[PDB]
Amino acid sequence: EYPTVSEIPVGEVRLYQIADGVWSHIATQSFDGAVYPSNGLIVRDGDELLLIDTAWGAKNTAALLAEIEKQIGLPVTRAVSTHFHDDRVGGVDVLRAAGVATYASPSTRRLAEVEGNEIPTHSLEGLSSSGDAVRFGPVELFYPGAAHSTDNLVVYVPSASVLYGGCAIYELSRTSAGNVADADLAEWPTSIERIQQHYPEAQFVIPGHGLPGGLDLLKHTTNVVKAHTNRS
Numbered sequence: 001e002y003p004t005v006s007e008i009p010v011g012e013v014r015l016y017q018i019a020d021g022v023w024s025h026i027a028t029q030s031f032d033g034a035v036y037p038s039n040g041l042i043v044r045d046g047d048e049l050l051l052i053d054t055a056w057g058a059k060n061t062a063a064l065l066a067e068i069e070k071q072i073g074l075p076v077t078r079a080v081s082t083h084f085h086d087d088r089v090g091g092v093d094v095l096r097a098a099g100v101a102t103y104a105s106p107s108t109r110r111l112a113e114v115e116g117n118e119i120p121t122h123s124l125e126g127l128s129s130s131g132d133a134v135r136f137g138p139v140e141l142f143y144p145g146a147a148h149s150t151d152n153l154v155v156y157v158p159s160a161s162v163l164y165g166g167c168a169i170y171e172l173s174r175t176s177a178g179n180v181a182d183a184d185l186a187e188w189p190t191s192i193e194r195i196q197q198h199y200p201e202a203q204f205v206i207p208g209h210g211l212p213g214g215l216d217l218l219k220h221t222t223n224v225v226k227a228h229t230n231r232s
């Protein structure tokens with residue numbers, strides 16, 4: 001029942017209930033003559049919502065807020081971007097204009113600034129060293145080390161056992177490495193091991209793009225990263 005680029009007109013967003021008070025958001029974007037899906041997370045925080053990641057652009061992100069307003073009807077008070085690339089911070093101004101507090105690590109804020117990308121307002125302290133975790137309302141934020149990017153974070157919902165891996169985790173259908181221009185291929189498998197060791201109990205694993213699964217998405221990503229590393 002999980003939405004694919006099949007069920008999603010570009011410019012629109014669908015929500016998907018993963019567990020009680022946890023949803024993913026799914027959007028699509030054209031890039032380089034192909035159409036890709038993109039996932040983020042929505043976590044109920046009492047009577048408000050914490051959003052993880054934009055819906056990859058201003059137009060998509062305005063559709064996301066409208067769709068949250070339609071389908072959940074609770075206010076989005078805070079948002080966290082999991083790394084500095086446009087599919088995660090693109091739309092941060094839309095969030096800001098709607099009165100959402102936008103957050104990212106100083107590492108992410110620095111890299112977005114260098115990249116000329118949108119910059120989340122608020123800074124997340126205590127994530128600068130591999131293996132650091134901090135509590136952020138109904139989730140834990142975890143910096144596993146460099147992987148897809150040097151600043152990538154992952155997000156865990158303790159109450160529902162949902163691990164959101166963002167773009168550091170690939171879906172099973174992904175069989176070759178994506179865009180790795182900003183990746184640390186040498187450290188990626190070690191970073192995934194930190195994730196494995198810290199959340200052995202996760203029941204659902206949501207990748208940055210594509211279908212959810214279980215913890216074998218971690219091993220899958222390792223397999224793919226290692227194959228790419230060994231490319232001839």
Ligand SMILES: [Zn+2]
Binds near residue numbers: 083085148149167
């Ligand atoms: Zn990225």
Ligand SMILES: [Zn+2]
Binds near residue numbers: 101102122
């Ligand atoms: Zn603020």
Ligand SMILES: [Zn+2]
Binds near residue numbers: 087
């Ligand atoms: Zn991504």
